[PDB]
Design goal:
This is part of a larger assembly, with 9 protein chains of 9 kinds. Chain F has 6 helices and 9 strands, in the order αββββααββββααβα. By secondary structure, chain F is α+β, with helices and mostly antiparallel strands. The chains are: A alpha+beta, B alpha+beta, C alpha+beta, D alpha+beta, E alpha+beta, F alpha+beta, G alpha+beta, H alpha+beta, I mainly alpha. Chain F: One of its GO terms (cellular component) is nucleoplasm.
Chain lengths: 240, 204, 232, 238, 240, 228, 239, 250, 99
């Protein structure tokens, strides 16, 4: 106490509690996982329905930054739509200045330097968000990135954001990555959301899957959800 | 032109241990005089004067801006100003107004504040400092003053013959000019004293 | 920023400025130095050590030139020194672009300290933690001045700053007479430099710069090692 | 309690308390209910009078020919977002010569109220909205919050004791599609009367109804034309 | 003692000290990582381990060896988010030296530009001083190789061999006895002493996959990151 | 004891805007009644010393031609709101050639009721009573430092805030006349004031649809007193 | 560039800085002023001269124009800013409207200046209170006053400074029309009112009159001797 | 953010100042200046606060700052805050001459500074000035004048004023011993040497501890005289002789 | 004043007062010619009078360790400078930012 008010002051051992407080605000949020196959990235976000409380398809946390770039935000939803506008605005200036599609290595670095800049001053607070960046290209393959509220951004094959962070990634690494098509990954994501988060605190919940890769021609779009409905039928087979 | 709007003639000649400066005494507007006592030589310390010629607005404007900057220089230091430091000071003030300039051409003629060494220089309207060893002139009737001082200058000149020389250089060159005249004042300064004389010229 | 600009240095109810008195405490816990004026040149002598044998002494310099004839050292802290050196480098050029003449040593210290006083009254910043010793031979007579974090300026003959300055102050009060030569001044600046130095005085433990009437001249470690024989 | 003062300061629990104090400002306002059908979006509000002689404070206010909002918070933050709301609708009317979609209007609102919840020296906009619109894909009912989280819903209610209104809407959400206008409106005002004590009710003086639809511009009714809507009702049993 | 707000903002203590900068000196140590810089007679070795705790995490997006220009490389310790903001300042002001001046920036002049920026962050009392370190190597014309180190206080000096990170007092005390016994230093003697100094302080005796070597040569002035195969060549050569 | 000037209460309200409404209670009382024949309006001057000349103290201020006012609270803070309300009726007439309605005057005043802050001060400390005759007949509106615009039929604000409003609802109906509303208001005033009732303590201003310029001076105020 | 509110509200519904600034007005020298029908009068007490030092620069009754006269209270530094501000306004009003400035227009300039100077941020309010005396056209002698809050009134007899309540209570028991009939009686009345403020030995009383046709004329110290003598003469005739 | 603000603006709850009062009580420590006039001429006595042997004194005007061709000043307070005001007030006097070609009178130069010192007390939260300085000079309207500046921004006309708290006893001497229109350039100097002999605690009044500057009006020049080395000493030998003569009555 | 009518203070001694106390303590001592007791009082910037003994103890003690009954002025000059141990911080920067 006394050192944990401003984001500019240091602790007497040398850390910043305003960043430490914002990270566990992201921890108190529902689970969103991501995993890439050999030719694409598959997103999966658990979505909570309290009783009715909204439509069927409101406030979806699977945003769409560029034609070939996705989001899997989790945490404080209001600041997530702020980062989604900053990443949207960043990718247009790369298009206007240079004339081709933004590489994901830049787009993680350009956003993380904006997240880092809100951890230096007493005027502003750090963002209470964390998110995923998934892309696919014919000259760079698929990449999957991950940004914390501090600003540390580097690569992964499979990551998880939410309450069930360490509990869900235990069985993500039980899967294989190179020898899987992303059509197989879609029904593999659907069981991980279904295994974790038992219907005790939250009875009803949704399951939104988004997917970019070689089958989607590099364009990012949502999976056909009402069409063919193979996610939840294969996921509920794990009853024992 | 703009330099010929009022007229003027400033001459400075270097002697042996003394320097002399001279100017005319006319204020007019292109054909019509107004007075006979328009000051064109302003003192800057002791044994160091400055002459100005050209547009009569920029004569009185630069002579007050330079006096503004000179008193601040002499109070932030203790000493008086050297003649080289004045020439660098004026050349800054004329170059700041690079695009819309002051239509004037200064002439500096003084002595050393330490020794008795004379100094003469003249500047352009945008501030190109030009030092000589014999004489500098400025004004509308410039070419007549070059015809005087080339045939009427000797290296080592006592203050008696220095006064008799710059007087004949001014009284013959200015009486050939149309927009200059109406009296000539001559300052002859040296280490001991300062002598100011007004000549007897054609009043037409 | 926001636009705060509120002064954090106010008057005590006793009637003193507290933060400037604390900035002088950081100066006294610095490296010792000694500057002696001796009627033909001024000698600046600092005490430069390394924490280990791993450093490189040909990298960071103490006795620093300003224009061509104006030297400058310090006794406060390290990183605040390089700011007001670069400030004084640029500030000596606007004198030369206007007056076309090298700046007198009395004229920099009026201007460096006026930067430094106004720096303390302004808000949101701390004062500097560096005292200076500015010297130079202009118009025949040499000069030797001292600034402070309050922004005041003085004119010494033989002073000392840094650690154990009161021991060097009584030593220079007895050793330094009214006038010497430059070579007598270097001999007595080293004879007061290791009042509180270590045992070894090599060419890398000290670093001495002089101001002749020919100009500022920083001594290379060859002549420092050649003069340190039979020193004091 | 030292971290319960500014908006910039986080908490050791991880929850900013100035947003949590702004949610309680919404509950101080009077209750209002917004719902929709296949072809219409009707929001019904409840007015409060200050004294017996003063007029009732108005709740529903017109924005555009197809967008109308309700209110549940302060009045300075009401008109400050209202003047921003009218301004954006006529800009796209001027530039693209088309009415705005309702969904991308509200995305500008959540981006608008984000800045005074992160920088120092600003308060959150303590205000609650029920945005009801109509565009090229059907009617919409949107609610907001001072935490800048907008919700696409089918039937909600915000204000004082609005929990009792939500329970009426959950057990009648299936009938809210095959209902034209008259049983669409009178389902809505039965939700308001369950946010009332059992001794007073709607008296054509503290209630307003706004309807927008396919062939209908957003029209506000108050105190004269509410009386055809207030008929064929039944008293609350006890 | 604490007087006024000396424990919070960058002002002086009554003892003539200040605390927020010397709190930032142990803001490096929370990374749990160590970097070693060794200069030879014709080379300059940068060796630094990395810790990869996750199997679902890349081995290419982690390495702190960063390329400033074609002839200047660096290594970053401290925390990760602050270190990458320090690199984009170093990449940028090395480019302005080319545009303004024409020739390539020396490695000594670049640490003056960095340490003056860290001065101001110390200096203004309303922002955070970016606790991280900075070690540069490079070949200078007619001067040989150089090693410099910047600090969050904002000072630099030249070096012969000095490590940073967590273990300084154990690593530099090993390097003192190594240098002052006047051994030879050609290429591989420099690399072998750069491995064993990290291998005796940490006492690991690793596998060639965690450390990275960033050597630069007089004959090859380009900054070069070593391959995993040739790191194994230098490691089994010193294993007799 | 110095918290943020713009901070929500833990219960949900405000801090300093709540204190602004408290600072109206020390001001002098004022009564205005809307009647279909016209709007009457009354105030008490509260003269402190006989050396003070009374007519330099005013509470009724005309706005453009047909709109009156009544301030209660801080005097010089009210002078800023008056000088803006005069101008904003003139910009309406020299851009539309019509008189700004009484409701839309109060909207323009109530915009900057809570536009204080650090960038882009403190909230004001006066409540007002705008009354006038426009195209929808006579009108009477009431505002506050919280910017809560409202319409009242007969509002009474100031020191006797609760005491007058209780006595006023006792004797009021819809079909009043103008002469009945004038004599009824000063009955309320003399019950709530502490001094006597003369031609120097109170003042009136009645705006009519025909007599648009509200006009009321001394030697007529004595006639209304002596007839009751 | 300064954004910090200084004057905020209190929990009971008051201010802080305004009541504090009126305390500094209470710690000042008293200065009264009455009016009449042709000639106005105002005088200051508590001169407190060192009696060996200069006194033309300690004069605290000045004129903004050829019609309007000043008399302030409180601290002297804040008065000099307000006076030299108000000299500009009464001179720029003469540029637009050709009349001399009325006494009503110049007090609304000062009072509205002093209010917005408390409304804004980061600004220490003034601590003065003026007595503005000037007879306008049509021969209208009147006097106003100011206040650090920014209010203005019209009085017939004002008192400020240290012990204004005693002087105002003295003038309260003196509501005569005969004292505003004779001119020198009104001047002696000011000398009578200022007598029970300070020790008042006829040397610490600086008064100045204006007969609505001429600029202000300070009475002589020999005039103050004859005025104190006739006051002591008629006071002893109560036996 | 806001808890670091020092609040150098708010009134005391007593109802007076809180920050300016600290400097006005501080100003009496470590400074002593005075100045006397009653006829043609005006002087300024100063006091070398620390005269150490390893010092240059090459400036020849240490505490006196000749700010114009007609005026000068004696400053006491913060050393470096004096240099801000003397650079400013020297420049105010020169922009007047640019505008009018007429020398600045002594009255409306002092008022130009006191408006600057006041404005850094009201708004901004700036640290106020801790500088109290004196004024001499000559105008075309009154002549030889003295003024006393304050950190609050208040001035006044004087004839025997002072600055230091040690010199508060000197005012008791100057009320006891002062003449009205009988000043010479000897009766005024010998009075000041008598003051600093008693008010300063330096025994025997060492001539390297005092400093005296006078302003006379010679023909049209207003010569500002700074007297240096031996005239101080023979003034002391004149003063010590008169003290040895007057003590013979004892 | 109903109880105590007289409140006599005791100021620090002056230069002649320091000189006269010094002559009392040096009267019982042994002195060498060519010595100035006035400068000893003049090197005491506002002394206390109690330390006039302390100078006369340290001067005779320095003459003791030479087994010498003679004393110079230099012995008194080291005796005064020893007792003058004040926490005055003579950096020429504490009494010198405040001229």
């Amino acid at each position: 106490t006394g050192y944990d008010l401003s984001a500019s002051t240091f602790s007497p051992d040398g850390r910043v509690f305003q960043v430490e407080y914002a990270m566990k605000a992201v921890e108190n949020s529902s689970t969103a996982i991501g995993i890439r196959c050999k030719d694409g990235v598959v997103f999966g976000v658990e979505k909570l329905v309290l009783s009715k409380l909204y439509e069927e398809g409101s406030n979806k946390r699977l945003f769409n930054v560029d034609r070939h770039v996705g989001m899997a935000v989790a945490g404080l939803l209001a600041d997530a739509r702020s980062l989604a506008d900053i990443a949207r605005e960043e990718a247009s200036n790369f298009r206007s200045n240079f004339g081709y599609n933004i590489p994901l290595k830049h787009l993680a670095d350009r956003v993380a330097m904006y997240v880092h800049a809100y951890t230096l001053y007493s005027a502003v607070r750090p963002f209470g968000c964390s998110f995923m960046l998934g892309s696919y290209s014919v000259n760079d393959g698929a990449q999957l990135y991950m940004i914390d509220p501090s600003g540390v951004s580097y690569g992964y094959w499979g990551c998880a954001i939410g309450k069930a962070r360490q509990a869900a990634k235990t069985e993500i690494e039980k899967l294989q990555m190179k020898e899987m098509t992303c059509r197989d990954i879609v029904k593999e994501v659907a069981k991980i959301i279904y295994i974790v988060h038992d219907e005790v605190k939250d009875k009803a919940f949704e399951l939104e899957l988004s997917w970019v890769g070689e089958l989607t021609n590099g364009r990012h779009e949502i999976v056909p959800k009402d069409i063919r409905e193979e996610a939840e039928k294969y996921a509920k087979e794990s009853l024992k | 032109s703009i330099m010929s709007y009022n007229g003027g003639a400033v001459m400075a000649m270097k002697g042996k241990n003394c320097v002399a400066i001279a100017a005319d005494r006319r204020f007019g507007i292109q054909a019509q005089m107004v007075t006979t006592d328009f000051q064109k030589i302003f003192p800057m310390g002791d044994r160091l004067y400055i002459g100005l010629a050209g547009l009569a607005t920029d004569v009185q404007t630069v002579a007050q801006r330079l006096k503004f900057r000179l008193n601040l220089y002499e109070l932030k230091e203790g000493r008086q100003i050297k003649p080289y430091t004045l020439m660098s000071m004026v050349a800054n003030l004329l170059y700041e107004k690079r695009f819309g300039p002051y239509y004037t051409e200064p002439v500096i003629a003084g002595l050393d504040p330490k020794t008795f060494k004379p100094f003469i220089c003249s500047l352009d309207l945008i501030g190109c400092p030009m030092v000589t060893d014999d004489f500098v002139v400025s004004g509308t009737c410039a070419e007549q003053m070059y015809g005087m001082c080339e045939s009427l200058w000797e290296p080592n000149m006592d203050p008696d013959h220095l006064f008799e020389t710059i007087s004949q250089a001014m009284l013959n060159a200015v009486d050939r000019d149309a927009v200059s005249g109406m009296g000539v004042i001559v300052h002859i300064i040296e280490k001991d004293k300062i002598t100011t004389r007004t000549l007897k010229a054609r009043m037409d | 920023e926001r636009g705060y600009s509120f002064s954090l240095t106010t008057f005590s109810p006793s009637g003193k400025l507290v933060q400037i008195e604390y900035a002088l405490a950081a100066v006294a816990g610095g490296a010792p130095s000694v500057g002696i004026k001796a009627a033909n040149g001024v000698v600046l002598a600092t005490e430069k050590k390394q924490k280990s044998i791993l450093y490189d002494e040909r990298s960071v310099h103490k006795v620093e030139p300003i224009t061509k004839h104006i030297g400058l050292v310090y006794s406060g802290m390290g990183p605040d020194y390089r700011v007001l050196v670069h400030r004084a480098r640029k500030l000596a050029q606007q004198y030369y672009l206007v007056y076309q003449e090298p700046i007198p040593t009395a004229q920099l210290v009026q201007r460096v300290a006026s930067v430094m006083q106004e720096y303390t009254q302004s808000g949101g910043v701390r004062p500097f933690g560096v005292s200076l010793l500015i010297c130079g031979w202009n118009e025949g007579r040499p000069y030797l001045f001292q600034s402070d974090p309050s922004g005041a300026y003085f004119a010494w003959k033989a002073t000392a700053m840094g650690k154990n300055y009161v021991n060097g102050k009584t030593f220079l009060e007895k050793r330094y007479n009214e006038d010497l030569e430059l070579e007598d001044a270097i001999h007595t600046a080293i004879l007061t430099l290791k009042e509180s130095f270590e045992g070894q005085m090599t060419e890398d433990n000290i670093e001495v710069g002089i101001c002749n009437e020919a100009g500022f001249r920083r001594l290379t470690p060859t002549e420092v090692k050649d003069y340190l024989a039979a020193i004091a | 309690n030292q971290y319960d003062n500014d908006v910039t300061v986080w908490s050791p629990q991880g929850r900013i308390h100035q947003i949590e104090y702004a949610m309680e400002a919404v509950k101080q306002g009077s209750a209002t209910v917004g719902l929709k059908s296949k072809t219409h979006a009707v929001l019904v509000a409840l007015k409060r009078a200050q004294s017996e002689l003063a007029a009732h404070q108005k709740k529903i206010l017109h924005v555009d020919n197809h967008i109308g909002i309700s209110i549940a918070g302060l009045t300075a933050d009401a008109r400050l977002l209202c003047n921003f709301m009218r301004q954006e609708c006529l800009d796209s009317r001027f530039v693209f010569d088309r009415p705005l979609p309702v969904s991308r209007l509200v995305s500008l609102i959540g981006s608008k109220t984000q800045i005074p919840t992160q920088r120092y020296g600003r308060r959150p906009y303590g205000v609650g909205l029920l945005i009801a619109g109509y565009d090229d894909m059907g009617p919409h009912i949107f609610q907001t919050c001072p935490s800048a989280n907008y919700f696409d819903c089918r039937a909600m209610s915000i204000g004082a004791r609005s929990q009792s209104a939500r329970t009426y809407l959950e057990r009648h959400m299936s009938e809210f599609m095959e209902c034209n206008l008259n049983e669409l409106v009178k389902h809505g005002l039965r939700a308001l009367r369950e946010t009332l004590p059992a001794e007073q009710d709607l008296t054509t003086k503290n209630v307003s109804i706004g309807i927008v639809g396919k062939d209908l511009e957003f029209t506000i009714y108050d105190d004269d034309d509410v009386s055809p809507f207030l008929e064929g009702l039944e008293e609350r049993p006890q | 003692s604490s007087a006024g707000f000396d424990r919070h903002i960058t002002i002086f203590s009554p003892e003539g000290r200040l605390y927020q900068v010397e709190y930032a000196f142990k803001a490096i140590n929370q990374g749990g990582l160590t970097s070693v810089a060794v200069r030879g007679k014709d080379c300059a070795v940068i060796v630094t381990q990395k810790k990869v705790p996750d199997k679902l995490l890349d081995s290419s997006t982690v390495t702190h060896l960063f390329k400033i220009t074609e002839n200047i490389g660096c290594v970053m310790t401290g925390m990760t988010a602050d270190s990458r903001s320090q690199v984009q300042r170093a990449r940028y002001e090395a480019a302005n030296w080319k545009y303004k001046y024409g020739y390539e920036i020396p490695v000594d002049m670049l640490c003056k530009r960095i340490a003056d920026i860290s001065q101001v962050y110390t200096q203004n009392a309303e922002m955070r001083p970016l606790g991280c370190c900075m070690i540069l190597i490079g070949i200078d014309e007619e001067q040989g190789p150089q090693v410099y180190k910047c600090d969050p206080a904002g000072y630099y000096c030249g070096f012969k061999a000095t490590a940073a990170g967590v273990k300084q007092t154990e690593s530099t005390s090993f390097l003192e006895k190594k240098v002052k016994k006047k051994f030879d230093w050609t290429f591989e003697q420099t690399v072998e002493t750069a491995i064993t100094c990290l291998s005796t302080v940490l006492s690991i005796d690793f596998k060639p996959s965690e450390i990275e070597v960033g050597v630069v040569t007089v004959e090859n002035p380009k900054f070069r990151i070593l391959t995993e195969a040739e790191i194994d060549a230098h490691l089994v050569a010193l294993a007799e | 004891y110095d918290r943020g000037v713009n901070t929500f209460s833990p219960e949900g309200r405000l801090f300093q805007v709540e204190y602004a409404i408290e600072a109206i209670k020390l001001g002098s009382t004022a009564i205005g009644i809307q009647t279909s024949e016209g709007v009457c309006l009354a105030v008490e001057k509260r003269i402190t010393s006989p050396l003070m000349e009374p007519s330099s103290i005013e509470k009724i201020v005309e706005i453009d031609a047909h709109i009156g006012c009544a301030m209660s609270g801080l005097i010089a803070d009210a002078k800023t709101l008056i000088d803006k309300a005069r101008v904003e009726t003139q910009n309406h007439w020299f851009t539309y050639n019509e008189t700004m309605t009484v409701e839309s005057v109060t909207q323009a005043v109530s915009n900057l009721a809570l536009q204080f802050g650090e960038e882009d001060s403190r909230p004001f400390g006066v409540a007002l009573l705008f009354g006038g005759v426009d195209e929808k007949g006579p009108q009477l509106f009431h505002m506050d430092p919280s910017g809560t615009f409202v319409q009242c039929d007969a509002r009474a604000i100031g020191s006797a805030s609760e005491g007058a409003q209780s006595s006023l609802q006792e004797v009021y109906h819809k079909s009043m006349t103008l002469k009945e509303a004038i004599k009824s208001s000063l009955i309320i005033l003399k019950q709530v004031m502490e001094e006597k009732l003369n031609a120097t303590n109170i003042e009136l201003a009645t705006v009519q649809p025909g007599q648009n310029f509200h006009m009321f001076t001394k030697e007529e105020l004595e006639e209304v007193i002596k007839d009751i | 560039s300064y954004d910090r509110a200084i004057t905020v509200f209190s929990p009971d519904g008051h201010l802080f800085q305004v009541e504090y600034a009126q305390e500094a007005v209470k710690k000042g020298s008293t200065a009264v002023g009455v009016r009449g029908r042709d000639i106005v009068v105002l005088g200051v007490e508590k001169k407190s001269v060192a009696k060996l030092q200069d006194e033309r620069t300690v004069r605290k009754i000045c004129a903004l124009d050829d019609n309007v006269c000043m008399a302030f209270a409180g601290l002297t530094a804040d008065a000099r800013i307000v006076i030299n501000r108000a000299r500009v306004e009464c001179q720029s009003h003469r540029l637009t409207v050709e009349d001399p400035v009325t006494v009503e227009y110049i007090t609304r300039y000062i009072a509205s200046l002093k209010q917005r100077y408390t409304q804004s941020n980061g600004r220490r309010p003034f601590g003065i209170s003026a007595l503005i005396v000037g007879f306008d056209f049509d021969g209208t002698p009147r006097l106003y006053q100011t206040d650090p809050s920014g209010t203005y009134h019209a009085w017939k007899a004002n008192a400020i400074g240290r012990g204004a309540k005693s002087v105002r209570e003295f003038l309260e028991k003196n509501y005569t029309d005969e004292a505003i009939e004779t001119d020198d009686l009104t001047i002696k009345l000011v000398i009578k009112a200022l007598l029970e403020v300070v020790q008042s030995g006829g040397k610490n009383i600086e008064l100045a009159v204006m007969r609505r046709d001429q600029s202000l004329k300070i009475l002589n110290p020999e005039e103050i001797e004859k005025y104190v003598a006739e006051i002591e003469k008629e006071k002893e005739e109560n036996e | 953010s806001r808890r670091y603000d020092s609040r150098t603006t708010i009134f005391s709850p007593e109802g007076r100042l809180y920050q300016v009062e600290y400097a006005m009580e501080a100003i009496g420590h470590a400074g002593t200046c005075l100045g006397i006039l009653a006829n043609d001429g005006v002087l300024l006595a100063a006091e070398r606060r620390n005269i150490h042997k390893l010092l240059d004194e090459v400036f020849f005007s240490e505490k006196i700052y000749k700010l114009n061709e007609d005026m000068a000043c004696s400053v006491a307070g913060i050393t470096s805050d004096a240099n801000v005001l003397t650079n400013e007030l020297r420049l105010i006097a020169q922009r007047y001459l640019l505008q009018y070609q007429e020398p600045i009178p002594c009255e409306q130069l002092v008022t130009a500074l006191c408006d600057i010192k006041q404005a850094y007390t009201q708004f901004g939260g700036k640290r106020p000035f801790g500088v109290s300085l004196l004024y001499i000079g000559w105008d075309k309207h009154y002549g030889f004048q003295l003024y006393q500046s304050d950190p609050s921004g208040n001035y006044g006309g004087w004839k025997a004023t002072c600055i230091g708290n040690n010199s508060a006893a000197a005012v008791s001497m100057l009320k006891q011993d002062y003449k009205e229109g009988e000043m010479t350039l000897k009766s005024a100097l010998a009075l000041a040497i008598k003051v600093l002999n008693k008010t300063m605690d330096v025994s025997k009044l060492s001539a390297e501890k005092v400093e005296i500057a006078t302003l006379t009006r010679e023909n049209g020049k207003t010569v500002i005289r700074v007297l240096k080395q031996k005239e101080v000493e023979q003034l002391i030998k004149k003063h010590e002789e008169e003290e040895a003569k007057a003590e013979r009555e004892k | 004043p109903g109880r105590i009518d007289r409140k006599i203070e005791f100021p620090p001694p002056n230069e002649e007062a320091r000189l006269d106390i010094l002559k009392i303590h040096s009267r019982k001592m042994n002195l060498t010619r060519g010595i100035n007791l006035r400068k000893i009082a003049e090197l005491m910037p506002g002394a206390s009078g109690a330390e006039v003994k302390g100078v006369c103890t340290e001067a005779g003690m320095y003459a003791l360790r030479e087994r010498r009954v003679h004393v110079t002025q230099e012995d008194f000059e080291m005796a005064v400078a020893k007792v003058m141990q004040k926490d005055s911080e003579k950096n020429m920067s504490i009494k010198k930012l405040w001229k």
